[PDB]
Structures are given as C-alpha cells and as structure tokens.
Amino acid sequence: KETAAAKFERQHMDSSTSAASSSNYCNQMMKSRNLTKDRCKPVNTFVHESLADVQAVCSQKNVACKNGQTNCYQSYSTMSITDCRETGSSKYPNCAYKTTQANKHIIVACEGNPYVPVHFDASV
Template sequence: MGLEKSLLLFSLLVLVLGWVQPSLGRKPSVQDFKRQHMDPGSPPNSRPTYCNQMMKRRGMTKGSCKRVNTFLHESWAKVQAICSQRQMTCKTSSKKNCHKSSSPLHITECRLKGSSKYPKCDYTTTNSQKHIIIACEGNPLVPVHYDASV
C-alpha cells in the first residue's frame, strides 16, 4: 500500500509541476513579444485613449498596471529583420543578444500617469519615430524582448 501511495503522490506532483512550471521563470517568447508590442494594422495616431485601450486589451492591466510599454506600428517582417542588424549589449540588462534597428520605426509609447492606481490604469500616449533595441533568440533569431527606444 505504501508504494501505491508513493506512486500516486509522485504522479500528482509531476502533473502539478507540468502545469505550474511553464509559468515559473519562463523565458520570453515570440508570442509574448507580439502580444505586448506589435500593432502593425494601426498607424500611429493622436488618440489620447489609445494606450488605455490597448494596454487593457492586451492584458497588461490585469492584477497591476504595467508602468511602461511600447507598441510598434510596423510589419512583423520589418521588426523580425532587426534581429539580423547590429548586435549590441542590451540597455536594461548585461545580455549581449540585443539588436538596434538601422532606421527609425513608428512607435507609440505608453507611460502610466503618476496619479494612476490599479485597477484604474491611466496612460499617456506618445507617438514618435525612433530606433528600437530588441533582444532576439532562437534559430532563426526572432524578437523576444523589447529593450529600449533611442
């Protein structure tokens, strides 16, 4: 009977870890990058509510307000091509897998307003054209982390 209980507990442990573990210490993914940063069908505009709507729609106001996020208004092919451009050390970490765009891209920067508190996340919307720095991983290299704009 003791062996059966042990096997049952071990099976349950494997099941639980298989379900929970992917979210713990998970590596950044292409899907996360696309959800958080890509908005190719939407040209930059001056709607002040753009960030409030997009941050909520893309799930970045669940549980807390994400402080800063940047949306890219370019095609996926153009953003992915940055992974083959100039490699550099990332600005937000010491990793060396970042790449800087060779030309400015259309972006929208969303910043949480100082007085804003969860659950009422309120953002400023700023449209511009800037060079971006992204981290790329895999083979072939694909964007997995938005590092900075310059």
C-alpha cells in the same frame, strides 16, 4: 503555452495603426493586450511596423542589452512607435497612461530558432 515570441507580439506589436491612433490609445491597448491584468505595467512600447520589419531587426545592429547580455539589436531605420507610460494618478485596476507617438530606432532582444524578438529593450 504562450511562446516568448508570441508574448513579444502581444506586448509590443501593433501594425494595424500606422501611428498612435488617439489620446486614448495606451489606455485601450495596455488593457486589450493584457498588460494591466495583474498590475498596471508601468511602461510599454508598441511598434507600428510589419512583423517582418520588426523581426528583421534581429539581423541588424548588434548592441548591448540594458542587462548586459549581448543579444540586443537596434534597427537601422527609425520606426513608428507609441510609448505608454503610467500617469501619476493611475490606480490599478483602472490603469491610466500617457500616449506618446514617436519615430525612433527600436532595440529588441532576440532569441531562439528561428532567431526572433523576445523583449523590447529601448528606443533611441
């Protein structure tokens, strides 16, 4: 029902905030976006750029995906992102996360027609 493109937007897009709102950000967002529903998803990145900017990465720099597929693309510009990483003390269902804001190139996997982001591979 939920397209892979929609799921990418749900898991990785947050254009409302231009940086990691607060120390609470990840705790709130991993829950709100249903990334703590079944397990504590252990790491996850949010992007604070427009959807059009992130989508445009699919026509940017073609690089190898971590799994060895060829459909990953690195942004020529740095982007505002927040990484969310599970604390050691985190215990499902109360998933707890460190919020780290950064500005880095993002790497996304794209697929489909139209050719859109479906996975967040890495940032560099």
